[PDB]
Protein backbone atom coordinates (compact mmCIF):
# COMPACT_ATOMS: atom_id res chain seq x y z
CA UNK A 1 0.00 0.00 0.00
CA UNK A 2 2.86 2.38 0.82
CA UNK A 3 5.15 3.33 -2.06
CA UNK A 4 8.86 2.57 -1.97
CA UNK A 5 9.79 6.23 -1.62
CA UNK A 6 7.36 6.71 1.28
CA UNK A 7 8.57 3.62 3.17
CA UNK A 8 12.08 5.08 2.82
CA UNK A 9 10.90 8.46 4.17
CA UNK A 10 9.38 6.77 7.25
CA UNK A 11 12.62 4.80 7.50
CA UNK A 12 14.61 8.06 7.64
CA UNK A 13 12.14 9.37 10.26
CA UNK A 14 12.79 6.43 12.58
CA UNK A 15 16.56 6.55 12.01
CA UNK A 16 16.82 10.29 12.68
CA UNK A 17 14.14 11.13 15.27
CA UNK A 18 14.51 9.91 18.85
CA UNK A 19 11.81 12.33 20.08
CA UNK A 20 9.09 12.39 17.42
CA UNK A 21 8.99 9.15 15.42
CA UNK A 22 6.25 7.26 17.28
CA UNK A 23 3.95 10.27 17.76
CA UNK A 24 4.23 11.36 14.12
CA UNK A 25 3.32 7.90 12.89
CA UNK A 26 0.25 7.76 15.14
CA UNK A 27 -1.13 10.94 13.54
CA UNK A 28 -4.60 10.73 11.96
CA UNK A 29 -5.29 10.73 8.24
CA UNK A 30 -3.53 13.24 5.97
CA UNK A 31 -1.62 14.79 8.88
CA UNK A 32 0.78 11.83 9.21
CA UNK A 33 2.58 12.05 5.85
CA UNK A 34 2.52 15.86 5.91
CA UNK A 35 4.22 16.09 9.34
CA UNK A 36 6.64 13.24 8.48
CA UNK A 37 7.81 15.17 5.41
CA UNK A 38 7.88 18.45 7.37
CA UNK A 39 10.23 16.78 9.84
CA UNK A 40 12.52 15.38 7.14
CA UNK A 41 12.85 18.64 5.24
CA UNK A 42 13.70 20.53 8.40
CA UNK A 43 16.13 17.79 9.44
CA UNK A 44 17.88 18.23 6.06
CA UNK A 45 17.99 22.03 6.43
CA UNK A 46 19.42 21.65 9.94
CA UNK A 47 22.04 19.14 8.78
CA UNK A 48 23.32 21.89 6.48
CA UNK A 49 23.17 24.63 9.13
CA UNK A 50 25.13 22.50 11.60
CA UNK A 51 27.89 21.15 9.36
CA UNK A 52 30.99 23.20 10.16
CA UNK A 53 33.01 21.86 7.20
CA UNK A 54 30.77 23.97 4.96
CA UNK A 55 32.03 27.54 4.72
CA UNK A 56 29.79 30.54 5.41
CA UNK A 57 30.17 31.64 1.78
CA UNK A 58 28.71 28.39 0.43
CA UNK A 59 26.24 27.84 3.29
CA UNK A 60 24.39 31.16 2.89
CA UNK A 61 23.01 30.44 -0.62
CA UNK A 62 22.10 26.88 0.41
CA UNK A 63 20.05 28.06 3.40
CA UNK A 64 18.45 30.89 1.38
CA UNK A 65 17.35 28.66 -1.52
CA UNK A 66 16.73 25.39 0.32
CA UNK A 67 12.97 25.96 0.00
CA UNK A 68 13.33 26.04 -3.81
CA UNK A 69 15.11 22.67 -3.89
CA UNK A 70 11.83 21.04 -2.83
CA UNK A 71 10.67 21.82 -6.39
CA UNK A 72 13.91 20.61 -8.03
CA UNK A 73 13.41 16.86 -8.51
CA UNK A 74 17.11 16.23 -9.17
CA UNK A 75 18.52 18.26 -6.26
CA UNK A 76 20.70 16.46 -3.72
CA UNK A 77 23.80 17.28 -1.63
CA UNK A 78 26.79 14.94 -1.40
CA UNK A 79 29.38 16.95 0.54
CA UNK A 80 27.97 16.50 4.07
CA UNK A 81 30.07 14.90 6.82
CA UNK A 82 27.24 14.98 9.39
CA UNK A 83 25.75 11.73 10.76
CA UNK A 84 22.30 12.51 9.29
CA UNK A 85 23.76 13.12 5.80
CA UNK A 86 21.55 10.51 4.10
CA UNK A 87 18.56 12.88 4.07
CA UNK A 88 20.65 15.29 1.99
CA UNK A 89 22.16 12.57 -0.22
CA UNK A 90 18.73 11.06 -0.88
CA UNK A 91 16.92 14.40 -0.89
CA UNK A 92 15.09 13.62 -4.17
CA UNK A 93 13.13 10.85 -2.41
CA UNK A 94 12.07 13.31 0.30
CA UNK A 95 11.26 16.09 -2.18
CA UNK A 96 9.29 13.53 -4.22
CA UNK A 97 6.99 12.72 -1.30
CA UNK A 98 6.84 16.43 -0.52
CA UNK A 99 5.47 17.06 -4.02
CA UNK A 100 3.02 14.20 -3.36
CA UNK A 101 1.33 16.24 -0.56
CA UNK A 102 -1.74 18.41 -1.10
CA UNK A 103 -0.88 21.96 -2.04
CA UNK A 104 -2.11 23.31 1.28
CA UNK A 105 0.55 21.29 3.11
CA UNK A 106 3.29 22.13 0.58
CA UNK A 107 2.72 25.88 0.90
CA UNK A 108 3.11 25.74 4.68
CA UNK A 109 6.22 23.55 4.55
CA UNK A 110 7.89 25.69 1.85
CA UNK A 111 7.12 28.98 3.64
CA UNK A 112 8.57 27.73 6.92
CA UNK A 113 11.59 26.39 5.04
CA UNK A 114 12.20 29.77 3.38
CA UNK A 115 11.81 31.68 6.65
CA UNK A 116 13.97 29.34 8.69
CA UNK A 117 16.78 29.39 6.10
CA UNK A 118 16.84 33.20 5.99
CA UNK A 119 16.99 33.18 9.80
CA UNK A 120 19.70 30.55 10.15
CA UNK A 121 21.77 32.47 7.58
CA UNK A 122 21.39 35.67 9.63
CA UNK A 123 23.00 34.01 12.68
CA UNK A 124 26.03 32.66 10.84
CA UNK A 125 27.58 36.13 11.27
CA UNK A 126 26.79 36.71 14.97
CA UNK A 127 26.67 35.35 18.51
CA UNK A 128 23.56 35.38 20.66
CA UNK A 129 23.92 38.55 22.75
CA UNK A 130 20.67 39.63 24.45
CA UNK A 131 17.73 37.54 25.66
CA UNK A 132 15.68 39.01 22.82
CA UNK A 133 18.32 37.76 20.38
CA UNK A 134 18.06 34.39 22.10
CA UNK A 135 14.32 34.44 21.44
CA UNK A 136 15.02 35.44 17.83
CA UNK A 137 17.44 32.57 17.23
CA UNK A 138 15.02 30.09 18.84
CA UNK A 139 12.16 31.50 16.75
CA UNK A 140 14.05 30.78 13.53
CA UNK A 141 15.02 27.21 14.44
CA UNK A 142 12.14 26.07 16.69
CA UNK A 143 9.49 28.74 16.98
CA UNK A 144 8.75 28.45 13.27
CA UNK A 145 8.42 24.69 13.57
CA UNK A 146 5.55 25.06 16.04
CA UNK A 147 4.10 27.78 13.83
CA UNK A 148 4.32 25.46 10.82
CA UNK A 149 2.98 22.43 12.71
CA UNK A 150 0.05 24.59 13.81
CA UNK A 151 -0.66 25.76 10.24
CA UNK A 152 -0.65 22.10 9.12
CA UNK A 153 -3.10 21.16 11.92
CA UNK A 154 -5.40 24.01 10.78
CA UNK A 155 -5.03 23.32 7.04
CA UNK A 156 -6.00 19.69 7.59
CA UNK A 157 -9.12 20.96 9.40
CA UNK A 158 -8.79 18.53 12.34
CA UNK A 159 -8.15 21.71 14.37
CA UNK A 160 -9.80 25.18 14.32
CA UNK A 161 -8.22 28.14 12.54
CA UNK A 162 -7.15 29.60 15.91
CA UNK A 163 -4.46 26.97 16.37
CA UNK A 164 -2.72 28.04 13.15
CA UNK A 165 -3.54 31.70 13.68
CA UNK A 166 -2.24 32.16 17.25
CA UNK A 167 1.40 32.42 16.18
CA UNK A 168 2.54 33.62 19.63
CA UNK A 169 1.39 30.44 21.40
CA UNK A 170 2.83 28.17 18.70
CA UNK A 171 6.10 30.12 18.88
CA UNK A 172 6.31 29.61 22.63
CA UNK A 173 5.77 25.87 22.11
CA UNK A 174 8.86 25.92 19.86
CA UNK A 175 10.87 28.22 22.15
CA UNK A 176 10.35 26.03 25.21
CA UNK A 177 11.76 22.84 23.71
CA UNK A 178 14.68 24.67 22.10
CA UNK A 179 15.68 26.64 25.23
CA UNK A 180 15.44 23.33 27.08
CA UNK A 181 17.82 21.55 24.69
CA UNK A 182 20.23 24.53 24.63
CA UNK A 183 20.31 24.64 28.43
CA UNK A 184 20.78 20.84 28.63
CA UNK A 185 23.43 20.69 25.93
CA UNK A 186 25.87 23.33 27.27
CA UNK A 187 28.89 20.99 27.49
CA UNK A 188 28.30 19.04 24.27
CA UNK A 189 27.92 22.35 22.43
CA UNK A 190 30.97 23.88 24.13
CA UNK A 191 33.04 20.81 23.20
CA UNK A 192 31.89 21.09 19.56
CA UNK A 193 32.58 24.83 19.27
CA UNK A 194 28.94 25.99 19.25
CA UNK A 195 27.65 28.61 21.71
CA UNK A 196 23.95 29.29 22.29
CA UNK A 197 23.62 30.78 25.83
CA UNK A 198 22.93 34.49 25.56
CA UNK A 199 25.99 36.62 26.27
CA UNK A 200 24.06 39.33 28.12
CA UNK A 201 23.21 36.63 30.67
CA UNK A 202 26.43 34.66 31.12
CA UNK A 203 28.67 37.75 30.88
CA UNK A 204 27.37 38.81 34.31
CA UNK A 205 28.98 35.67 35.70
CA UNK A 206 32.13 34.93 33.64
CA UNK A 207 34.25 36.43 30.87
CA UNK A 208 33.86 33.50 28.41
CA UNK A 209 31.01 30.95 28.14
CA UNK A 210 33.57 28.12 28.23
CA UNK A 211 34.54 29.27 31.71
CA UNK A 212 31.43 27.57 33.12
CA UNK A 213 33.31 24.35 32.35
CA UNK A 214 36.02 25.10 34.92
CA UNK A 215 35.40 23.43 38.32
CA UNK A 216 36.35 26.59 40.23
CA UNK A 217 33.41 28.38 38.56
CA UNK A 218 30.73 25.76 39.37
CA UNK A 219 28.72 28.00 41.74
CA UNK A 220 28.53 30.83 39.20
CA UNK A 221 27.74 28.25 36.52
CA UNK A 222 24.75 26.90 38.47
CA UNK A 223 23.49 30.43 39.13
CA UNK A 224 23.50 31.16 35.41
CA UNK A 225 21.93 27.79 34.74
CA UNK A 226 19.10 28.60 37.16
CA UNK A 227 18.57 32.00 35.61
CA UNK A 228 18.21 30.55 32.08
CA UNK A 229 15.90 27.73 33.26
CA UNK A 230 13.80 30.36 34.99
CA UNK A 231 13.62 32.28 31.67
CA UNK A 232 12.46 29.11 29.86
CA UNK A 233 9.72 28.41 32.48
CA UNK A 234 8.10 31.58 31.22
CA UNK A 235 6.90 29.71 28.10
CA UNK A 236 4.79 27.29 30.14
CA UNK A 237 1.69 29.43 30.53
CA UNK A 238 1.54 29.57 26.70
CA UNK A 239 2.11 25.80 26.33
CA UNK A 240 -0.87 25.20 28.63
CA UNK A 241 -2.99 27.61 26.61
CA UNK A 242 -1.94 25.93 23.32
CA UNK A 243 -2.42 22.32 24.56
CA UNK A 244 -5.87 23.30 25.96
CA UNK A 245 -7.26 24.03 22.49
CA UNK A 246 -6.39 20.83 20.66
CA UNK A 247 -9.41 18.78 19.54
CA UNK A 248 -7.80 15.74 17.93
CA UNK A 249 -6.29 13.01 20.14
CA UNK A 250 -3.34 12.21 17.86
CA UNK A 251 -2.42 15.91 17.53
CA UNK A 252 -2.79 16.46 21.26
CA UNK A 253 -0.40 13.55 21.97
CA UNK A 254 2.09 14.83 19.36
CA UNK A 255 2.14 18.29 20.96
CA UNK A 256 1.84 17.28 24.64
CA UNK A 257 4.46 14.53 24.91
CA UNK A 258 7.58 16.53 23.88
CA UNK A 259 6.51 19.46 26.08
CA UNK A 260 6.29 17.22 29.13
CA UNK A 261 9.60 15.49 28.33
CA UNK A 262 11.13 18.98 28.22
CA UNK A 263 9.64 19.94 31.59
CA UNK A 264 11.13 16.80 33.15
CA UNK A 265 14.52 17.73 31.63
CA UNK A 266 14.38 21.23 33.08
CA UNK A 267 13.44 19.88 36.52
CA UNK A 268 16.33 17.45 36.26
CA UNK A 269 18.64 20.34 35.31
CA UNK A 270 17.53 22.85 37.97
CA UNK A 271 20.33 23.68 40.40
CA UNK A 272 22.22 20.68 39.02
CA UNK A 273 26.03 20.89 38.94
CA UNK A 274 26.14 17.87 36.61
CA UNK A 275 24.90 19.86 33.63
CA UNK A 276 28.47 21.17 33.45
CA UNK A 277 29.94 17.66 33.38
CA UNK A 278 27.77 16.12 30.67
CA UNK A 279 24.28 15.19 29.64
CA UNK A 280 21.17 13.25 30.57
CA UNK A 281 20.43 13.00 26.84
CA UNK A 282 17.83 10.27 27.32
CA UNK A 283 14.11 10.83 27.95
CA UNK A 284 13.10 10.88 31.63
CA UNK A 285 11.28 7.58 32.17
CA UNK A 286 9.03 8.85 34.94
CA UNK A 287 7.83 11.38 32.34
CA UNK A 288 7.37 8.85 29.53
CA UNK A 289 5.42 6.63 31.95
CA UNK A 290 3.17 9.43 33.22
CA UNK A 291 2.42 10.47 29.65
CA UNK A 292 1.18 6.99 28.67
CA UNK A 293 -2.02 7.76 30.60
CA UNK A 294 -2.04 11.55 30.17
CA UNK A 295 -4.31 11.92 27.16
CA UNK A 296 -6.17 15.00 28.40
CA UNK A 297 -5.61 18.51 29.81
CA UNK A 298 -6.31 17.86 33.50
CA UNK A 299 -3.89 14.89 33.47
CA UNK A 300 -1.18 16.90 31.69
CA UNK A 301 -1.62 19.82 34.11
CA UNK A 302 -1.25 17.51 37.10
CA UNK A 303 2.08 16.29 35.71
CA UNK A 304 3.26 19.84 35.04
CA UNK A 305 2.39 21.02 38.56
CA UNK A 306 4.17 17.98 40.01
CA UNK A 307 7.43 18.83 38.20
CA UNK A 308 7.05 22.53 39.02
CA UNK A 309 6.68 21.53 42.67
CA UNK A 310 9.90 19.52 42.40
CA UNK A 311 11.79 22.63 41.25
CA UNK A 312 10.01 24.97 43.74
CA UNK A 313 11.06 22.98 46.81
CA UNK A 314 14.69 22.95 45.67
CA UNK A 315 15.10 26.66 44.98
CA UNK A 316 18.01 28.05 47.04
CA UNK A 317 17.09 31.20 48.95
CA UNK A 318 20.60 32.47 48.07
CA UNK A 319 20.20 31.90 44.31
CA UNK A 320 19.84 35.31 42.61
CA UNK A 321 16.87 34.24 40.49
CA UNK A 322 15.07 32.61 43.47
CA UNK A 323 12.26 35.19 43.53
CA UNK A 324 11.59 35.05 39.78
CA UNK A 325 11.57 31.27 39.76
CA UNK A 326 9.00 31.04 42.57
CA UNK A 327 7.01 33.72 40.82
CA UNK A 328 6.72 32.04 37.41
CA UNK A 329 5.98 28.69 39.06
CA UNK A 330 3.07 30.30 40.98
CA UNK A 331 1.73 31.75 37.71
CA UNK A 332 1.91 28.34 35.97
CA UNK A 333 0.02 26.81 38.90
CA UNK A 334 -2.90 29.23 38.53
CA UNK A 335 -3.13 29.27 34.72
C1 LIG B 1 8.09 18.92 12.34
C2 LIG B 1 8.75 18.36 13.61
C3 LIG B 1 7.95 17.56 14.64
C4 LIG B 1 10.08 18.63 13.88
C5 LIG B 1 11.00 19.34 13.13
C6 LIG B 1 12.18 19.69 14.02
C7 LIG B 1 13.43 20.04 13.22
C8 LIG B 1 14.20 18.88 12.59
C9 LIG B 1 13.78 21.39 13.14
C10 LIG B 1 14.87 22.05 12.56
C11 LIG B 1 15.70 22.81 13.61
C12 LIG B 1 15.83 21.96 14.88
C13 LIG B 1 16.68 20.69 14.79
C14 LIG B 1 15.15 22.29 16.05
C15 LIG B 1 15.22 21.46 17.36
C16 LIG B 1 14.40 20.16 17.47
C17 LIG B 1 15.09 19.09 18.35
O1 LIG B 1 14.23 18.14 19.01
P1 LIG B 1 14.90 16.74 19.55
O2 LIG B 1 14.35 16.26 20.84
O3 LIG B 1 16.49 16.99 19.68
O4 LIG B 1 14.86 15.65 18.36
P2 LIG B 1 15.69 14.27 18.50
O5 LIG B 1 16.13 14.18 20.05
O6 LIG B 1 14.63 13.10 18.27
O7 LIG B 1 16.86 14.11 17.61
C18 LIG B 1 13.93 21.42 18.18
C19 LIG B 1 14.12 21.51 19.70
C20 LIG B 1 12.70 22.16 17.59
C21 LIG B 1 11.38 21.41 17.77
C22 LIG B 1 10.27 22.25 17.73
C23 LIG B 1 8.96 21.79 17.64
C24 LIG B 1 8.77 20.28 17.58
C25 LIG B 1 7.77 22.75 17.58
C26 LIG B 1 6.79 22.55 18.74
C27 LIG B 1 5.61 23.22 18.47
C28 LIG B 1 4.30 22.75 18.41
C29 LIG B 1 3.98 21.28 18.69
C30 LIG B 1 3.19 23.75 18.07
MG1 LIG C 1 21.11 23.66 14.09
From Swiss-Prot:
It is an enzyme of class 2 (transferase). It catalyses: 2 (2E,6E)-farnesyl diphosphate + NADPH + H(+) = squalene + 2 diphosphate + NADP(+); 2 (2E,6E)-farnesyl diphosphate + NADH + H(+) = squalene + 2 diphosphate + NAD(+); 2 (2E,6E)-farnesyl diphosphate = presqualene diphosphate + diphosphate; presqualene diphosphate + NADH + H(+) = squalene + diphosphate + NAD(+). One of its GO terms (biological process) is steroid biosynthetic process. The chain crosses the membrane at residues 250-270. One of its GO terms (molecular function) is squalene synthase [NAD(P)H] activity. GO terms for cellular component: endoplasmic reticulum; endoplasmic reticulum membrane; membrane. Widely expressed. Its main location: endoplasmic reticulum. Pathway: Terpene metabolism; lanosterol biosynthesis; lanosterol from farnesyl diphosphate: step 1/3. Its cofactor is Mg(2+). It is found in: Endoplasmic reticulum membrane. It is a multi-pass membrane protein. NADP(+) binds at residues 18, 43, 184, 281, 283. Catalyzes the condensation of 2 farnesyl pyrophosphate (FPP) moieties to form squalene. Proceeds in two distinct steps. In the first half-reaction, two molecules of FPP react to form the stable presqualene diphosphate intermediate (PSQPP), with concomitant release of a proton and a molecule of inorganic diphosphate. In the second half-reaction, PSQPP undergoes heterolysis, isomerization, and reduction with NADPH or NADH to form squalene. It is the first committed enzyme of the sterol biosynthesis pathway. It is linked to Squalene synthase deficiency: An autosomal recessive disorder characterized by profound developmental delay, brain abnormalities, 2/3 syndactyly of the toes, facial dysmorphisms, low total and LDL-cholesterol, and abnormal urine organic acids. Belongs to the phytoene/squalene synthase family. This is Squalene synthase. The gene is FDFT1. The chain holds residues 35 to 369 of 417 of the full protein.
Amino acid sequence: SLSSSLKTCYKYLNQTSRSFAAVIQALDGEMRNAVCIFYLVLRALDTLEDDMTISVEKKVPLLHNFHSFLYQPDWRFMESKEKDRQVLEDFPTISLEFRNLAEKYQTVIADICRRMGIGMAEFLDKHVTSEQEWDKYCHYVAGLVGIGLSRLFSASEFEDPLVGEDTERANSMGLFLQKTNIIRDYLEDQQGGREFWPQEVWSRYVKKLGDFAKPENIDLAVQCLNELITNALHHIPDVITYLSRLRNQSVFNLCAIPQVMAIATLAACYNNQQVFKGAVKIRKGQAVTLMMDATNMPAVKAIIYQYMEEIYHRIPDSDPSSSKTRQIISTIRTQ
